[PDB]
Design a protein around this ligand. Structure first.
Ligand SMILES: [Mg+2]
Ligand SMILES: [Zn+2]
Lengths: 720, 1323
């Protein structure tokens, strides 16, 4: 009993304990912080670091004995704060948030002493923590031994973890306020103050904007010197006149050396900023990316505040033609209902008709509202007038990707679509009103049901997720990278998964960071493009797109030869860092976490139609041309792929047995031309030769029942 | 208008005229407990019912009967307030009249002796307070109503998961209130099985066997017969044409000379009509057709006696031949239509192993008590008592009514016990639905879900006590002798009172009052919980149960429910709903007389609502109850659509009736998403009362209803005139009209000053009225916590600007200006209670003295000689609250057990109480507390006596003036010198002795009343065994708002206060006024709560008007201007039900009303009949503000103007109970746990964070091996490791010494202690 069982030993003993030198409190914004630091309350810092304080106080001789150190700390004299400041300089602390889904739930920061009782958390990392400032609390641990300190500063520090371990993309991308400010900064206007004056550089652009002699966005000719490291790491200045806004120049001040000007020249939304950070990281490296992100934050916050963006009742414009659309759809539903009461259409058919017409009306009103609101600013230049992408504050919040999607804009200004009853069936009459207007009892009630069901779904989904991820991390824990290279030639031939219409996911992303199983040749033999196993970094991937490699055999972990673990080469590079995997990292647990944590937001075919102009190619088929002049398909596993101009398989379809074909092999098919035909709910059996049908073991009455019609040759002979 | 209403009128929007006024909100609880007590003659619901149910108690054939007459509720010994103070339960003694009768023994029974017991005391029953709560140990408890499945019969489907091949298997469940359950279910093979309450499923027919029915009787009762006559040869069948519905023809159906249906063609409608009009009864049929049928009865050979075919046996040619030769002319076969009418009872009979009644009873007995040999009479008695014993099996009046209604029987009133006809009809309906001529019921229908309130549950528990005690009295009366004992040694009250107090105290539905907000109280009392006894447990219950059924309309709130794991299982009750006579749910509706919408209201339950077409409240009626539109929007079967004018039977009473009180308080609900409305209400119930609550600028009008109906306000009982006003009591002189003639006196309302609420908040009442103001019955004299002049003021309304300000409001976080903390408007008072208990140990009692060993006189300085802190002394964490010494034996001193202030809490000692039930010694503090209460009692009694005495003296002067006027000498000599004076001997002298003796009687009543009060004050307040005395100390602490605290709005917007900025930095408009709150815009578009924006606009309009009137008033132009301005404001358009005007008094009340509205005129937008945008625009224009509601602002720090003007205006915000100072927590090293040496868990004790398995995995994903190493050994569990690490840190070096954990070495020794060789290898 002492050994076995939960209460006894192992199952409880070494499973989940309370530790010391730890605290917990509420988190707060603190924008002024550096990316690698965190605001820590004085009183918590003193309480945590108490023994350090005593040690340092005794070392400095300020206290004869330890009890005197306690008395001096409980009085809290200036010396105590000076010693605390001195000990804190480089000592890092660990921050943790209750549901640590992935390894970015725990990170180390350098603390900065502040007043107050709230922990100040750097904004950019909130996305990593899934942290929200609505009463969420955070825990703070102190690493004691020296090795723990070194480990925290090297492996776990915030600046060292910029790429997600799950996929390679950056995690610290600006979220909502920053992107809004930057969006405001880069957008241009047809006519403003300081139109068309020529500036010698960004510095006088700032002179002009800050003195109020020119608008923050106004089209202008500026001389700029961009740098390019085209040579073997040398920077060459190219200096020319570009046509841009003042704001884009002001932003250009921060941008590090290596980047092309083009990067900032556009509207600069969420995606644009993300890809900017991506390029900055891939080209320059870590430290410039960090500093550039910090600069982006500061400038975005500042100019968002200077913008003064707000939300008034008049900012959401009800489309003028809504009422007409509603009256028309109501008249149509009334006509279809009356034509139902006469009994020419079933109830289900009427249901379908009403639901479809209401959906169409919803789409119409949504599109009309989006047209009205989006580009409505018809402002005038010197003479005639012009029109441009509006400055409606809600529209900027939508388009920038800071908050909200088109759906919520619709939900504000359009009709809020159809609803689902408990069982999933859709109510016949929709909710025609919107939140700008007022709902009535029924429509509200319905939306209440909707929200209740949604929330309960999210709850159960979270429970199920937790359970699934626990099993995953349990099973795969022991796998570790033990060897550098097993030296096998085996590998998997990886292709881009082209499901039907087009290339849902390209090769380049699919192969990036995998070592090759063997050298791949150009479309012409003895033209080696990649030596034996090489790590495929961006440059090799780019090289592959200019050529036309379609499928690449790459070493996979499953085929790895190593005993009791895997070898570095079979795995590949992908990490929060960029380089090939290091011997010793436990990839099982990172893999299990990366697959588990994101799992909390998861809830006819008659004719083929070629989408893009290309040659048709049939794979794994053996046809027999008949008299009608058709390439008769006699194989059930027949495929029809599409080779493009430069030798690449764009579209792929599976053609079943018995589908009428039109074009064979070689023929170029025009855009959207019908190449095949077959009955959807019918697979015909096709005869290859002619003549009379002879019955063999086809006896009448025992296994078949002759139910035959008259001369015209109708029958119901049934081979069951 | 009322006087408090005339004080400050609230501008009310809203178009439809309120026909029904909001009922008393706490009706449920009070009415239920009233029904519980409810002395009534005819045994209806009520304790009376329980008594008559259990009595008469007859001896075990001893002929000594016990009869019940009536009961009486004793008068409570302790009033409510004193009961809270003294820590006892507020209750009434229950007394019952019984008679013991002894009849002739060994003789025809005749009343020999009858003895009447002298009003036996049968225990204490807690009483309910005026507000509808219960005081159980000096803590206010609430008994939440419980929703549960009503007794009766239900036919469920339980499909989908049945063997995954379709096969929808139906089932009928019979559930009684008291008694075992009955269940009928099917099987894949359509055989219908019975399963006693919760056992295995047996063939149903066994029960039919127990009911004494033979197989032939059953097949008669169930199956439709088919007749085969043999006339002169070969098998002619009597046929009912209509039976053929849907049947392929098996033979050639010839009739009357002509073949009609060819053999093989299914009978078509043409053939059916032909045969029907031809009137064909009998047709000869080939023997092959009958060669397959089944026989109904057990046909014996009547001649010889030998049996041939048994009941329900398949027919074969040989049996047909034997029957035909035996001479059987009339054959009864079964009709087995494989499509519609199946052989279900037949097949069950085949699988049924039991044959006789006795074998069925044996199998039944072997099911309940498997393994012990069943004896016949045991089974007989068991089965009899199972379903037909009045005592054990009772459904209800409600159960029986529902039972009869489900099976469509006209009779409503039945017998409690389950009769046989019930079961047979139930089985008939089950097989009927199994054929498909019926629908299954849905459990979620409110017509199937009944509400059990307090009185019903208390009655059940009391009945349980009664059945126990009846068994007890039964045995004692049986064994013991009959005539010696009297009927009070025999009956024990202890277990009954024990059961009642366990239920009231230690029950799931009986919980502490959530007491920080008036809204919290009112919503807690009107709650419906589906958990508790006979309640669903949370984890198994499915998602389908927690959905909102269309039946909930107007009965339960769709939006108010905790968002935690038990969402949907709480469902706060709607505003207007009531309970039926039977405990169902009903809602009001206005009757519709074909054209006119009349004004009589009828309450409809769920089922009645289901049938009719109900019109919506927001339907336009013009002056005579007619709908303006020809086709109006209604709901009939839970689905809305358009119906004609002359079809609607009823109409909704008002728009508010859908939502609870909490949701009804939110303005502009119509513009908030349901999720954010839900969260808004749930949070709004957590707001803490501030120092001076003021009012919402944008309300809904319900604030006064909530404030009045909650018991937090002090409300006048008899109207009169306020005679004396103090900040502790309000004394009012009653008006002569309402003044009772004999022994009336005046009315005195004692107020309550700062006391501790359940949540540690302050509960203080302030007087509203002033000296000499007239008050009427039902006005609000004194304001409770967080209410002003009758209105609910949960929080405060401040000037917000929507903008991002250098990312300090980045996410939902909030920026706040230093003026709010300077002006102290968000500072709350909290109140902790501490208790020091001095018990009696066996080594000797501990002492409370102030003589405490080896403590410095600093600690004593704040203690009096008795050892209790002085009221008003400032204490800090660690200070000694009171001095106590534990005695030591085998010395008493040298150690201190004195209570100390908890660490890190510092406040002022506002109050101290001392409870010594023994009364040994008494103590100083008891003397002071007794004198404070006593002096008050004396003052009150003295006041009453002096008023009555003044009256008596006035009458004595009026008699003395008659019979010789004496006014010069009299008035200047003292008044007490008028009794000793004399008058001429007449009737007047008789009146003087009369008045002197009445004066004496008033004195004697005064003295005895005083003695009584002093006896009540002095007595020991009964404490638990072993405890000498207890001292409670209340600390009060003023907590100011600081960064990290949580603030919220009414619409679901939340935030943490991130920074306090200086006044100068905050944005300011041209006029120079800085904003108060800076709110993030990005919370609007994705969280589609637009109600806050309209609230901000309307609040700016209202505050603009208030500012304009304050400016115009400070210059004091003239009354005329004020009246004109206020009238033009109050009118504001049309369609409003306000109707105010200047009819009110001309000068004083207008000046007072202007003074109160100068801070901003309060608006009232009802929930769905609210204020449209145009009205807000108009009101903003009237104030001379931008019509768009946004203004240009200058940045107060830098001074440059902001482009694109921003929205500013006043919004009503609340500070929620999530206060940062409670959440923040840290530990370096501290106390560890006893058994497993891990650090304590908690906040009171230091306590560490829980490093869970998920965090281990997170760290493992990194290469962090050393962190885990310290985390597992050095940080928590290794004693030597922790001390070594402490010493190393103290030495100023930061290393560590590795090795195997000692716990691991212990593991080695423990495994090695077995016969297992486990070795530590080496290389
Ligand atoms: Mg949160
Ligand atoms: Zn390998």
């Amino acid at each position: 009993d002492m050994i076995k069982g939960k209460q006894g030993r192992f199952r409880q003993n070494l499973l989940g304990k309370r530790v010391d030198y730890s605290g917990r409190s509420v988190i707060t914004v603190g924008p002024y912080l550096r990316l690698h630091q965190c605001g820590l309350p004085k009183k918590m810092a003193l309480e945590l670091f108490k023994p350090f304080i005593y040690g340092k106080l005794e070392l400095r001789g300020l206290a004869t004995t330890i009890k005197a150190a306690k008395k001096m700390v409980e009085r809290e004299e200036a010396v105590v704060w000076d010693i605390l400041d001195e000990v804190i300089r480089e000592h890092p602390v660990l921050l943790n948030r209750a549901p640590t889904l992935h390894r970015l739930g725990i990170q180390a920061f350098e603390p900065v002493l502040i007043e107050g009782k709230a922990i100040q958390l750097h904004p950019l990392v909130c996305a990593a923590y899934n942290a929200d400032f609505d009463g969420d609390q955070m825990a703070v641990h102190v690493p004691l031994t020296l090795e723990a300190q070194l480990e925290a500063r090297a492996l776990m520090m915030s600046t060292n973890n910029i790429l997600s371990p799950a996929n390679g993309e950056p995690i610290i991308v600006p979220s909502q306020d920053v992107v809004l400010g930057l969006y405001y900064m880069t957008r241009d206007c047809v006519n403003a103050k300081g139109e068309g004056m020529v500036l010698t550089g960004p510095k006088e652009a700032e002179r002009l904007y800050r003195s109020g002699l020119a608008s923050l966005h106004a089209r202008v000719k500026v001389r700029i010197t961009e740098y390019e490291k085209d040579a073997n790491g040398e920077l060459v200045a190219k200096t020319s006149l570009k046509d841009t806004t003042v704001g884009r120049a002001i932003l250009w001040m921060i941008v590090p050396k290596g980047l092309p000007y083009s990067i900032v020249n556009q509207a600069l939304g969420k995606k644009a900023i993300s890809k900017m950070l991506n390029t900055c990281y891939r080209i320059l490296g870590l430290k410039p990316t960090v500093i550039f992100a910090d600069q982006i934050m500061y400038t975005g916050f500042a100019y968002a505040a200077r913008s003064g963006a707000s939300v008034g009742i008049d900012d959401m414009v009800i489309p003028e033609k809504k009422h007409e659309i509603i009256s028309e759809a109501e008249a149509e539903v009334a006509e279809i209902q009356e034509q139902f009461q006469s009994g020419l259409v079933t109830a289900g058919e009427r249901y379908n008709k009403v639901i479809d017409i209401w959906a169409a009306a919803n789409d119409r009103v949504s599109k009309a509202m989006m047209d009205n609101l989006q580009t409505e600013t018809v402002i005038n230049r010197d003479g005639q007038e012009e029109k441009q992408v509006s400055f409606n504050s809600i529209y900027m919040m939508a388009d920038s990707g800071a908050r909200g999607s088109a759906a919520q804009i619709r939900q504000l200004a359009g009709m809020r679509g159809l609803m689902a009853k408990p069982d999933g069936s859709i109510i016949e009459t929709p909710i025609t009103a919107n939140f700008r207007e007022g709902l009535n009892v029924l429509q509200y009630f319905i939306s209440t049901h909707g929200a209740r069901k949604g929330l309960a779904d999210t709850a159960l989904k979270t429970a199920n997720s937790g359970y699934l991820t626990r099993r995953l991390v349990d099973v795969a824990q022991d796998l570790v990278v033990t060897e550098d290279d097993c030296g096998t030639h085996e590998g998997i031939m990886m292709t881009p998964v082209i499901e039907g219409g087009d290339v849902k996911e390209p090769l380049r992303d699919r192969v990036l960071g995998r070592v090759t199983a063997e050298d791949v040749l150009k479309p012409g033999t003895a033209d080696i493009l990649v030596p034996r196993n090489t790590l495929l970094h961006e440059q090799w991937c780019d090289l592959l797109e200019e050529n036309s490699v379609d499928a690449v055999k790459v070493r996979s972990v499953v085929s790895c030869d190593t005993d009791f673990g895997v070898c570095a080469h079979c795995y590949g590079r992908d990490l929060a860092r960029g380089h090939i995997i290091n011997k010793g990292e436990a990839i099982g647990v990172i893999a299990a976490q990366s697959i588990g944590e994101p799992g909390t937001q998861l809830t006819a075919e008659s004719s083929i139609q070629v989408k893009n102009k290309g040659s048709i190619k049939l794979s794994n088929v053996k046809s027999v041309v008949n008299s009608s002049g058709k390439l008769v398909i006699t194989s059930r596993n027949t495929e029809l792929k599409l080779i493009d101009e430069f030798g690449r398989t764009k579209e792929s379809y599976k053609v079943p047995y018995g589908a009428v074909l039109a074009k064979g092999d070689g023929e170029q098919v025009a855009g959207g031309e019908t190449v095949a035909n077959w009955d959807p709910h019918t697979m015909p059996v096709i005869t290859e030769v002619s003549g009379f049908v002879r019955f063999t073991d086809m006896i009448d009455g025992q296994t078949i029942t002759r139910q035959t019609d008259e001369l015209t040759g109708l029958s119901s002979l049934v081979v069951l | 208008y009322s006087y408090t209403e005339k004080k400050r009128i609230r501008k009310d929007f809203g178009k439809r005229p309120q026909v029904l006024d909001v009922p008393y909100l706490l009706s449920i609880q009070l009415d239920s407990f009233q029904k519980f007590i409810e002395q009534d003659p005819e045994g209806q619901y009520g304790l009376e019912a329980a008594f008559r149910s259990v009595f008469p108690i007859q001896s075990y054939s001893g002929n000594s009967e016990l009869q019940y007459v009536s009961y009486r509720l004793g008068e409570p010994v302790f009033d409510v307030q004193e009961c809270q103070i003294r820590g006892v339960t507020y209750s009434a003694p229950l007394r019952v009249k019984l008679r013991l009768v002894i009849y002739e023994r060994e003789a025809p029974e005749g009343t020999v002796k009858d003895i009447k017991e002298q009003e036996v005391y049968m225990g204490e029953i807690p009483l309910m307070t005026d507000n509808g709560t219960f005081v159980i140990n000096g803590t206010e408890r609430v008994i939440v109503s419980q929703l549960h499945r009503s007794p009766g019969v239900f036919f469920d489907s339980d499909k989908g998961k049945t063997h995954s091949s379709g096969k929808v298997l139906y089932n009928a469940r019979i559930i009684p209130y008291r008694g075992s359950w009955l269940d009928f279910e099917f099987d894949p093979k359509d055989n219908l099985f019975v399963r006693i309450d919760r056992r295995r499923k047996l063939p149903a027919t066994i029960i039919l066997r127990a009911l004494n029915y033979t197989t032939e009787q059953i097949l008669d009762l169930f199956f439709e017969k088919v007749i085969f006559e043999i006339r002169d040869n070969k098998l002619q069948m009597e046929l009912v044409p209509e039976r053929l519905r849907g049947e392929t023809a098996s033979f050639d159906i010839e009739a009357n000379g002509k073949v009609y249906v060819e053999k093989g063609r299914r009978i078509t409608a043409r053939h059916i009509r032909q045969l029907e009009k031809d009137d064909v009864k009998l047709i000869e049929v080939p023997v092959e057709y009958i060669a397959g049928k089944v026989v109904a009865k057990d046909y014996i050979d009547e001649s010889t006696g030998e049996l041939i075919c048994a009941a329900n046996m398949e027919l074969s040619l040989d049996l047909l031949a034997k029957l035909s030769q035996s001479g059987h002319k009339r054959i009864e076969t079964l009709f087995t239509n494989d499509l519609d009418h199946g052989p279900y009872i037949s097949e069950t009979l085949r699988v049924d192993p039991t044959n006789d009644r006795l074998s069925a009873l044996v199998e039944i007995y072997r099911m309940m008590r498997p393994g012990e040999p069943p004896t016949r009479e045991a089974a007989e008695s068991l089965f009899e008592n199972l379903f037909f014993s009045e005592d054990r099996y009772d459904l209800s009046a409600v159960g029986r009514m529902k039972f009869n209604r489900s099976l469509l029987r006209e009779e409503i009133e039945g017998s409690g016990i389950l009769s046989k006809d019930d079961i047979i009809d139930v089985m008939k309906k089950l097989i009927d639905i199994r054929n498909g001529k019926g629908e299954v019921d849905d459990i979620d229908h409110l017509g199937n879900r009944r509400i059990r309130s307090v009185g019903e549950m208390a009655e059940n528990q009391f009945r349980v006590g009664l059945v126990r005690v009846e068994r007890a009295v039964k045995e004692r009366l049986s064994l013991g002798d009959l005539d010696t004992l009297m009927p009070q040694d025999m009956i024990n009250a202890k277990p009954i009172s024990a059961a009642v107090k366990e239920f009231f105290g230690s029950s799931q539905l009986s919980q502490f009052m959530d007491q920080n907000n008036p809204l919290s109280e009112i919503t807690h009392k009107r709650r419906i919980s589906a958990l508790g006894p006979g309640g669903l447990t949370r984890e198994r219950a499915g998602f389908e149960v927690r959905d909102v059924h269309p039946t909930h309309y107007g009965r339960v709130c769709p939006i108010e429910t905790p968002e935690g794991p038990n969402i949907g299982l709480i469902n706060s009750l709607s505003v207007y709903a009531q309970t039926n006579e039977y405990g169902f749910l009903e809602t009001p509706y206005r009757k519709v007389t074909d054209g006119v919408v009349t004004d009589e209201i009828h309450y409809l339950s769920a089922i009645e609502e289901g049938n009719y077409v109900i019109a919506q409240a927001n339907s336009n009626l013009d002056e005579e109850g007619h709908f303006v539109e020809d086709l109006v929007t209604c709901r009939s079967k839970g689905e809305s659509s358009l119906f004609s004018r002359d079809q609607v039977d009823y109409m909704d009473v008002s728009t508010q009736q859908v939502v609870s009180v909490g949701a009804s308080l939110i303005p502009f609900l119509e513009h908030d998403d349901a999720n954010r409305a839900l969260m808004g209400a749930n949070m709004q119930r957590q707001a803490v009362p501030t120092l001076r609550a003021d009012k919402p600028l944008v309300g809904t009008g319900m604030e006064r209803a909530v404030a009045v109906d909650s018991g937090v306000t002090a409300v006048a009982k008899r109207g009169g005139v306020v005679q004396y006003v103090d900040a502790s009591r309000i004394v009012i002189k009653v008006n002569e009209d309402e003044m009772y003639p004999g022994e009336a006196g005046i009315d005195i309302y004692n107020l309550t000053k700062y006391t501790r609420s359940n949540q540690n908040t302050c509960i203080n009442q302030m007087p509203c009225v002033s000296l000499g103001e007239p008050v009427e019955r039902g006005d609000v004299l004194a304001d409770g916590p967080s209410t002003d002049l009758g209105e609910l003021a949960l929080g405060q309304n401040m000037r917000v600007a929507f903008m991002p300000w250098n990312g300090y409001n980045f996410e939902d976080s909030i920026l706040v200006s230093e003026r709010v903390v300077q002006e102290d408007r968000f500072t709350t008072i909290h109140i902790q209670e501490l208790a020091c208990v001095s018990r009696d140990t066996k080594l000797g009692p501990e002492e409370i003295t102030a003589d405490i060993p080896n403590v410095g006189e600093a600690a004593l300085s704040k203690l009096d000689e008795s050892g209790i802190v002085y009221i008003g002394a400032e204490v800090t964490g660690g200070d000694i609250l009171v001095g106590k010494v534990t005695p030591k034996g085998e010395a008493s001193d040298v150690k201190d057990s004195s209570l100390r202030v908890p660490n890190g809490v510092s406040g002022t000692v506002i109050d101290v109480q001392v409870f010594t039930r023994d009364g040994v010694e008494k103590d100083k503090r008891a003397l002071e507390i007794e004198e404070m209460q006593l002096k008050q009692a004396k003052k009150d009694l003295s006041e009453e006596l002096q008023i009555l005495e003044a009256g008596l003296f006035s009458r004595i002067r009026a008699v003395l003036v008659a019979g010789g006027v004496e006014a010069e000498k009299l008035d200047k000599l003292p008044r007490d010198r008028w009794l000793e004076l004399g008058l001429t001997d007449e009737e007047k002298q008789n009146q003087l002795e009369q008045l002197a003796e009445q004066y004496d009687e008033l004195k004697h009543e005064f003295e005895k009343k005083l003695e009584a009060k002093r006896r009540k004050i002095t007595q020991g307040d009964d404490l638990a065994p072993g405890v000498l005395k207890i001292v409670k100390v209340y600390l009060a602490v003023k907590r100011r708002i600081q960064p990290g605290d949580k603030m919220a709005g009414r619409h679901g917007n939340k935030g943490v206060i991130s920074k306090i900025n200086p006044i100068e930095d905050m944005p300011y408009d041209e006029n120079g006024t800085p904003v108060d709150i800076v709110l993030n815009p990005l919370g609007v578009p994705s969280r589609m709560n637009i109600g806050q924006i309209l609230e901000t606009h309307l609040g700016m309009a209202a505050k603009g008007i208030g500012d304009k009137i304050n400016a115009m008033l400070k210059q004091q132009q003239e009354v005329a201007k004020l009246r004109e301005f206020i009238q033009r404001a109050y009118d504001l358009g049309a369609d409003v039900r306000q109707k105010v005007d200047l009819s009110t008094f001309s000068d004083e009340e207008v000046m007072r009303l202007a003074e109160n509205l100068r801070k901003g005129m309060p608006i009232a937008t009802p929930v769905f009949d609210g204020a449209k945008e145009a009205e807000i625009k108009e009101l903003l224009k009237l104030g001379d503000l931008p019509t768009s509601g946004q203004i240009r602002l200058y940045d107060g720090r830098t001074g440059e103007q902001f482009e694109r003007p921003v929205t500013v205006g006043y919004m009503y915000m609340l500070k929620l109970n999530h206060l940062v100072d409670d959440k923040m927590h840290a530990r370096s090293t501290g106390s560890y746990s006893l058994v497993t040496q891990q650090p304590l868990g908690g906040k009171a004790q230091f306590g560490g964070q829980r490093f869970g398995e998920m965090e281990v995995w997170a760290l493992e994903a990194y290469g962090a091996a050393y962190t885990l190493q310290e985390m597992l050994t050095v940080k928590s569990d290794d004693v030597n490791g922790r001390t070594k690490m402490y010493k190393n840190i103290v030495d100023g070096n930061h290393q560590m010494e590795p090795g195997m954990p000692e716990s691991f070495n212990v593991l080695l020794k423990e495994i090695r202690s077995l016969g297992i060789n486990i070795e530590l290898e080496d290389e």
